[PDB]
Amino acid sequence: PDEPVKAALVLHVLVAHKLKKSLDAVPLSKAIKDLVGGKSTVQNEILGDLGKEFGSTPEKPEDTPLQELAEQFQDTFPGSLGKQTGSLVNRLMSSKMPGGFSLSVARKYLQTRWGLGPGRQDSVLLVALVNEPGARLSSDGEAKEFLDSCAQKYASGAGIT
């Protein structure tokens, strides 16, 4: 069941996080310059977080849509955690979660309750990153409806259990 991350599960997530939009809400099949409109600050900031650890920069950003970037990047993507792509995960993990909820106790619960594996537990924090709560969760038991619903949206992908 275990397989590494696809760039359409790690970087299509990130460009939906900057627009504060949903997964189906972006058209997914058009270029970055046409996505944001004419804001021209987030457009240079999308290439800011698309160029940190990711073999940093492609041959040209604004010619490919959100798939046709990633089909080029699969031979360059080693299945990394993310330096500051994956640091937005820790931002959710400290600002919106109760006291005593760093990534040690979370990654235990993703395996010992549902069963995902470390190759698939990267791609379930990112579907937690697109739907963040508006406030910090006031109890440890609030991770039983927030974090469990991320694996149910992950069940709309490969669909294991």
Residue numbers in the entry: 139 to 299
Task: Copy text verbatim from the article accompanying this structure deposition.
Unlike the dissociated systems of individual enzymes that make up type II FAS systems in plants and bacteria, Type I FAS systems in fungi and animals are large complexes that integrate the key enzymatic activities required for fatty acid biosynthesis. In particular, yeast type I FASs are 2.6 MDa hetero-dodecameric complexes with an α6β6 configuration, which form a cage-like structure comprising two dome-shaped reaction chambers on either side of a central platform. Along with structural support regions, enzymatic domains form the walls of the reaction chambers, with most active sites facing the chamber interior. The mobile acyl-carrier protein (ACP) domain tethers the growing fatty acid chain and carries it between active sites, so each can act on this in turn.
